[PDB]
Symmetry: D5
Subunit: 156 residues, 10 copies
C-alpha cells in the first residue's frame, strides 16, 4: 500500500546519511541510478527526499549504499516535497536557478500564454535533464531541459 | 553613454503601458521582436523591464507600440532586475517554475557538481527558449531549455 | 491575439471599479453572469481579476456595469493571478478556507495519495461551486465542491 | 478530564512515529479508521496531530499500530492545530489547495456573502470528504467537499 | 442586494475621510452612534471599515459627517476585514492587545478547552464593549468584554 | 533573590512535561490552582511559561504534578514571555483572539482614546477571566474580561 | 473632543511637508520647540507624527512652519504610532539603537528584573533626552537618557 | 590568541546553564560581577552570550557558578552577537525598548544630526547603565543611560 | 542649519528624476562628480539618496542635471539611508555583493577579530572605490576596496 | 569523485567542533592555513563550511585540529553555502558589511555598469583579502579588497 510523509525532515535526514555513505564509497549519482531503469535526475531527487522510488530501485540503491531496512522503506514513501530551506536559496548554485526566475518568470508567463494559451506548464507531468556540452568559446555549458505538459485553463 | 536604473517600478510601470498599447493594437511578442535581430525571449524580457534594448531595437519596438521618446529611452536603460512582486510568485503559470526549484533545486546542485564541479551555472551567460511540441499521448508539451555557462570556483 | 498581464494591480483596480458600479446599480453576481454561458464562479473570478473573459462575455458584463472600452479589453487579458493581498488572508470569511488548509492540508495530502497515487489534484483543470443547504439542526450550511483532475507523478 | 496541547511538535513527532509504524505494517488510512465509528478524514487528521480521538478510538488505532500508552493518551489530547510548517506549503500536493485560495478566495467571499449574507463558513462545524471519480474525458478527478455551517455576523 | 468588497483600501481610504470630517466637526464616536440602534463599538468598527452599516444607520451617520452618496453606499458594503497594516501592530495602544495574546493566548486555549471543550470562541457571533471604571488606587481602568458563542468541534 | 530567563524554550519544554504529567493524573487547571491563593488564569499562564509562581505556589503545584526540584525552581523564574510560536497563531482557538484584533483593533484604539485619552491600556497591570454563560438562543457563550489600567502619555 | 488617526501615512506625509518647510526656512528643532513649554524630543516627535501637540503648541509651531489649518489640526490628533517603515531600520543612525537592543536587550531585561522586579519599564510614562558631552578621551559622545516609570507585574 | 564564534546557540545554550546554576545558588548579577572590576551590565551581557570575558574574569565567574573548563573557555570567545530570537522581541520587558524605537527612532535620528551632524551614535564604543530613581509622584523610575561615541560621516 | 530626512521615498523619487535627466543628457557619473571636489562614489551615492551634498556640490550637480531649487535643497539633506527595496536584492548585480556576505560573512568576522580584535570595521568612517583591472587570463576584473576604521569593543 | 552537501547544518556543526578544538589548542587561522598552499580567507571559509578543501589541505588542517576521518572527508565535500542564519546578520561585525550594501548597493550597480557595462561582478571567480593599515589620523584601518571577474550580459 502507498505510504506518504508529512514532515520533510525525516527524508532530509536520510538524504544526509545517504550522502555520507555515498562519499565514503566514492560513488557518483550516475552510477547509483545505473540499473534502476530510472533517469539520473529522478533517482537523485529521490535520494534527496523529493521523489519516491519503486520497491526494486529502492532495494538496489540501498544495496549500493548499505542502507538498513527502515531506510529502503523510507525511500519508497511519497515525500513531503520541498528542498529549499526557507523559500529563497542561500547557495549560489541553487540561487542562480531562482535568479533565472527573477529575470524571466514574467517572460516565461507571457510566452507560455502566446504559444499555448491560458494555463500552466506542469512540474508533475514533467521530466528534466542536465547535459554537459562544449561551449564553442572554451569551457562547458549546462543545457537544462524542462519538459512539461501544457495544461489549459478551460472555463466552466 | 550607458545609463542604469535603481528602482524597478519605473520600468515596470512602462511595461504595463506597453502591454496596454500591445493589447489595443492586438500584437504578439513574436511580431514585436520581428526585425530586431534579438530572440523573442530577450525582447520580451526587455519590454517587461528585465533587459536593456540597444538603441535601434528600442526605436523599432517603440514605433510599433507608438511609445513616446522618454519610453524609448527608458527601454535602453540597464534595468533594476527582479520581476517577482514579493519573492514567491502567486500566479500559477509563474509559480510552477518556482515549484520545479522546490522539487529539483538540490538535484540541480548535486548534478551540476557531479558533471562540472564546484561552481555555478550562469544566469548572465545564459539563454532560454520555449518550444511547443505535441505529446505522443495527446496535447502539447512545453520544452523550456535553460542554457548557461559553467563558471567554476577555483581556490586562491 | 491573446494578451497577458504581469501586474495584478491593474485588474484589481478595475475589480474595485466594477464593484462600485455593481453596488450603484444594485446587481448580484448571478445576474451579471446570466447570459454569458459561463458559471457564476468563473465570471465572478474574472470580474475580480482571476480569470479572462472571452470577448462576447466581456462586452455583455461590460454593458451591464457600464464599463469603458479599455475596461472591456482589460477583462479579456489573461491575468497575473493572486487574489490574497499578503499570503495569509486577514478577512474572516476568506481566512476560514485557509484555516481548513491549516487543519486538513496534510490529511488531504495523505488521502489523495492513498485514493489516487503520487501526484496532485489540479487547480487549472478545475471547477468549484457553492451551494446553500438547510441544516437539520437549524440554519444554513455551505457545501463547497472542489473538483479537479488527478495528475499523477510518473517516474522517468 | 479534557487535556490540551500548546506546542504542535509533540503530536507532529507522534505523527511521524505513526507513519513509520503504518508503513512497516503496510496499513492504509481506510483500514485504521475502520471500526472507529469515525470518518476516514477525521481519524487521519487525528493521526496527523490535527484532531483528538475519543479514548475508545485512540485505544483501537493504538493497538493497530502497536503504540504505547503515552501515545494512546496523546491522541486524545486536544491539539495545537496547524499542519503547515511555515504558512505556505512547499509540497505540490498541499500547495494546490492553497493555489485554489489564491485564485478563488475573493470569489468565494463574494459568493458566500451573496448566497448566505455577512458572515463566514465554519471550519469547526464542518466536514470533509475526498472521492475519486472517472473523468468523462478520460482520467480521474477528485471531488473534495467542504461542508460547513453558515455563521452570520449579526449587528449589536 | 448585498454588496461586498475585496481590497480593504477603498474602505480604509473612506475611514480616513470619515475621521477628518469627524475632527472638523469635533464629534465623538458615542455621538455618531447615537440614534443608530447599534452599539458604539459596532458603529465605530464600521466607520473604520470593519463592519457593514444597515441602510438607515448609514444615511444617519452620513448626515452627521456630511458624506457623499458613494460613501454612504460604501458603508453598507460587506468589508474585506483586517485593520492591522502588517500583521503585528506598531501603535502602542493597539500593540497591548496583541501583547495580551502573546502572554495569555495559550492560557485562553487551555481554559476554553477546560470550561467549554474542543472548539473555538466565535469572533462573528460576538459583541465587544469598552467600559471606563475607577481604579481603587487612583486613576482609571478599561474593562473590555469579549462576548462570543462557543462552537464545538465534534467528530464526524 | 530574583531569577530570570532569556530563552523561552526552557519554560516551554517544562510546560510540555507539566501537561503530560497533568494528563496522566487527569487533573484540571481549576484543581491545580486550587490551594494557591492565585487566580486560575494566573496559575495556568505560569505553568505555560508566561508567569512566575511565588515559592509556595511553585511548591504546591510541583507536588501535585510530581515535578523535580529543578522544575519547581524553573517555575519561579521570571519568564521570557511570548507564547505564539511565530507571531500569528495557527490553532483555530488561539487564532480567533487574533482575529478579534484584526476586526476591532482600530476600534479599540479609537474608543480608548475617546474614553480615557492619549495613552494605552496596560497588559501588565491587567487581569483576565473567562466565564461560561448560557446563550438564551441555545448553547453557551464565553465571556472574556480584559481589565487593564489606563496609562496616559503626558507631554514633557 | 479628542481626535485620533488609524493610518500612519496621513501624519507621515505631513512630517515630510513639515521637514521641507523647515529646510526652506533653515530652521532647527530647538527653535521650533522654543516657547512651547515642551521638551525638544517631545515636540520633534509630534512633527514626525509620533506624538499629539496640545492646541497651544500646535498653533505655535504651525505659525513657525507656515502650516495650513488642516495641518495644525492634524498635529493635535492622536497618531497611529510607529516610525519604522518595516520593523527593522535600514538607516545607520537609527539602526544603531536597534543594535544596542540586539547586544543588550536580554541584559536590560535581566537587570530590570534584578533592580525593580517583574514588570516593564514604561515607554509611555516616559521622558527622553539627548546631550552632546565632550569625550574625556577626545571627540564628542552622545548621552541619551531613557527615563521611564517601572510598571510591576504582580499576581491576581 | 583571540577566538571567536559563528553560531549563537553555543553561547546561548551556555547562558541557559549559567542561569540555572545562578538560580540554584540564588545569586544575583551584581554579586557575580563583583570582584571582577567590570561593570555589571558588561558581565551580565557576557554571561548571556553578548560579550567576551577576559580569562581572569571568565575564571572568576566560573568559580562562583561552578562551571567546567569548556564553559570557562567559551565565555572568553568573541561572540556571534544577537540576543533577540527573531528580530522583534516577544517579551514585554524587552519589547518596550523596541517600542521606544518605534516612537522615538526618527526623533533620535533628527536630534543626532542637529546636535552632532551626519553620522551615528556608537553601539561599540558605548556603555549603558540602569539606575533606580524614586518618582516624586510615587514608586520608581528606571533611568537607563545610553552613552556612545559620536562617529561622523564625512565626504570623500 | 543641518536638515535631515525620515522617509526614504522623497530622495529615491528624486534619484529617479535625476536618472532620467542624466540619460536625456547622456551624462556619466564620472562627469557629474567632476568639479565637486568629491569622489565619484560619494557623489553618485548622494544622487541615489544615500549621502548629502554640500551646498556648492548640490548647486553644481543641480546646474548639470537641470534641477529646481527644492531638489538642489533635498540633495543637501541628510538622507534616510537604505537603498535595498526589501532587504535582499532582486537585481543580479546588487545581489552578488549580498552573496559575498553569504559566503564570506563569518570569515570576515573571524579574520577581523584575529587581525584587529573585538569590534567592527566602520561603514561611516569609510570609503570605497571600484577599479577596473585587466584579467591576465582574459577579460576584466573589478577590484572593489572597502576602507573602514577598526573600532574596538573594549570592556567597561 | 566529487561529493556535495544539501543541508548546511552538517558542515556548520563541524565548523563549531573545529572552532572549539581550535580554541582548546589556542590556534590562529593564519597558522591553520600555513602549509596549505591556500589563502587564509579561503581556508577559513572552508572550516566555516563555505568552501571545499582539496584532500591534502583537508588532511593537514585535520591533523592540526585532531579531527576524525569523517570530518576530514566532510571538509572536502562541496558545501551547501550560506553563512547567515536568517538573511540579515544580527552580529555587529557581520552587520556592517550588510550596511555597506544598504548604503552603497545602488552606487555599486551604477558604477559597475558605467565602468564595465551590463552584467555582474563574480562572487565565484573571486578573491577576497583583509589587510591592516595604520590610520594617518590615528589607530587602524581595515582594507578589504573584493576582486571578482566581470561577467557581461549581451543580447541573444
Ligand atoms: Cl502541475
Ligand atoms: Cl552568473
Ligand atoms: Cl495544476
Ligand atoms: Cl468557525
Ligand atoms: Cl474522505
Ligand atoms: Cl467564528
Ligand atoms: Cl503595560
Ligand atoms: Cl507600558
Ligand atoms: Cl558602531
Ligand atoms: Cl560604523
Ligand atoms: Cl558569479
Amino acid at each position: 500500500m502507498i505510504q506518504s510523509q508529512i514532515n520533510r525532515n525525516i527524508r532530509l535526514d536520510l538524504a544526509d546519511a545517504i550522502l555520507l555513505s555515498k562519499a565514503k564509497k566514492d560513488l557518483s549519482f550516475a552510477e547509483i541510478a545505473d540499473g534502476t531503469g530510472l533517469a539520473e535526475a529522478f533517482v537523485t531527487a529521490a535520494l534527496l527526499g523529493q521523489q519516491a522510488l519503486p520497491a526494486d530501485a529502492a532495494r538496489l540503491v540501498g544495496a549500493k549504499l548499505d542502507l538498513d531496512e527502515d531506510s529502503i522503506l523510507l525511500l519508497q514513501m511519497i515525500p513531503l516535497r520541498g528542498c529549499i530551506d526557507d523559500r529563497i536559496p542561500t547557495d549560489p548554485t541553487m540561487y542562480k536557478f531562482y535568479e533565472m526566475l527573477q529575470v524571466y518568470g514574467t517572460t516565461l508567463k507571457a510566452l507560455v500564454h502566446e504559444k499555448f494559451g491560458d494555463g500552466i506548464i506542469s512540474a508533475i507531468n514533467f521530466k528534466l535533464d542536465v547535459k554537459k556540452v562544449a561551449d564553442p568559446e572554451g569551457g562547458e555549458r549546462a543545457v537544462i531541459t524542462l519538459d512539461g505538459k501544457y495544461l489549459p485553463t478551460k472555463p466552466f
